[PDB]
Amino acid sequence: DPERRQRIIDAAIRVVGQKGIAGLSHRTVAAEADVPLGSTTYHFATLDDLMVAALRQANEGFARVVAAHPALSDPEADLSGELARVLGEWLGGDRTGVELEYELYLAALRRPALRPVAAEWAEGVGALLAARTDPTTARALVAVLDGICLQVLLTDTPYDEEYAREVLTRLIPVPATRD
Amino acid sequence: LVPRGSHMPRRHDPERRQRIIDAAIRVVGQKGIAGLSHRTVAAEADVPLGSTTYHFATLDDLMVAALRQANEGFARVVAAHPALSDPEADLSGELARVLGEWLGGDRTGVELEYELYLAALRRPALRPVAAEWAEGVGALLAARTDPTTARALVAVLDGICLQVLLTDTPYDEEYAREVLTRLIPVPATR
């Protein structure tokens, strides 16, 4: 029982993309990853375990984009404008891929074992923004940019960057003289 | 009100339609939206399979109906807060109070309600119903504010709830109020 762990994780993501999260089972990934079922359960005893791994890897979509935006840390750069731009890039990528990433993320709604992992996405963004604005504002930018994405993917309404920017700006404290 | 069996056989009237939908919700609650199907719904409603297909030809039609019934959870909490429509209403604090009430109800109900709502992510047939929901929530303060505030209300609301429900974070009303206060433009006059 070797290094098939990555093969299985990739397949698990493949299954969710095609059949959706409800079509992900120990057997479907085994079949999709072309590995015996015994392998599947050895690497991921429970289904929660396989999903926690599929989510950690899916969270890589948003993470790459944030990484491709170093200005998100530059004090002289506009926060909301760069933030609204990051969402656009993310939402503009492989539709089925964004859908998949968001699906696993939401799967934590009713699966207690996925909540910690789902928090990872938010802990990460919040920390990044915590270097540019206070913790409360950061917490709020996280919740709202999350709501904006869901809004687009749920109502099938095209992303509106300018709108996203005005909304995000309304959440950032205005600086005072002493600042 | 017209007694059942008055204009048509009981199995074809809206009371039967309602029984199936009610059953769809019990199913989603007990075994997740993943376990929802005409077969599990027919079973939970103790009705023939052909009866579920008579009222809902495809799974989408069934899910759309389950979703609209589910939305009545958040909606009823809103209607219980008519202070919302008052011209000098405290939108931020009232909307934050509404969240606390919804979030604080039986969590199993909150979960199946949100699960059905979020299922629109990959089910194209549920999106127009979501868009409808967004418009409905916005209309709550559309008139006395602006388009941006109106279309953004659901996003702010969903984000705050998703922030609670997905990470096991306690709901924070003062925080919720602060965020909503940042979204909704403070009125110049009264």
In sequence order, the 6+-apart residues with CB closer than 8 A to the CB of A93 are A61, A65
**Is residue B90 a contact partner of residue B132, using CB atoms and an 8 Å limit?**
no
A166·B148 Cβ contact <8 A: yes
Six-digit token pair at B53?
């297909």
Q: CA of A86: how far to CAs of A70, A81, A142, B3, in Å? A: 11, 9, 13, 58
For residue A5, give its domain range: 1-179
The tokens describing A88, both together, are: 């656009």
DSSP A109-152: GS-GGGHHHHHHHHHHHHHHHHTTS-HHHHHHHHHHHHHHHHHH
CA distance B127 to B102: 23
- CATH (domain of B66): 1.10.357.10
Q: DSSP 3-state assignment of B181?
A: helix
CA separation for the pair A61, A126 (Å, rounded): 17
- Exposure of A24 in the CB half-sphere (CA atoms within 13 A): 29
- Neighbour tally for A55: CB within 10 Å: 25
Residue B133 one-letter amino acid: W
Number of domains chain B is built from: 1
Q: How far apart are CA A102 and CA A74, in angstroms?
A: 28
Which residues of chain A have a CB within 8 Å of the CB of B32? 110
B92: nearest Cα among B156, B27, B17 = B156
Contact residues for B135 (Cβ-Cβ < 8 A; gap 6+): none
Tell me how far apart the alpha carbons of residues A149 and A128 are, in angstroms, rounded to a whole number.
19
End-to-end Cα, chain B, rounded Å: 45
A173: which DSSP letter? P
CA distance A148 to A152: 7
Q: How far is A2 from chain B (nearest CA, A)?
A: 32
Place of tokens 């929901």: B133
What residues of chain B lie within 8 A of the CB of A140, using their CB?
A: 175, 178-179, 182
Resolution (Å) of this entry: 2.3
User: Quick one: angle between helices B147-165 and B107-118, nearest 10?
Assistant: 120
Torsion of CA A81, A87, A92, A96, to 10 degrees: 180
Q: State the method.
A: X-ray
Q: What is the dihedral of CA A157, B178, A114, A90, to 10 degrees?
A: 40
Report how far residue A176's alpha carbon sits from residue B16's, in angstroms, rounded to the nearest whole number: 63
CB A59 within 8 A of CB A22: no
Q: What is the least distance, in Å, from the CA of B3 to any CA of chain A? A: 39
Q: Greatest CA span in chain A, whole angstroms?
A: 66
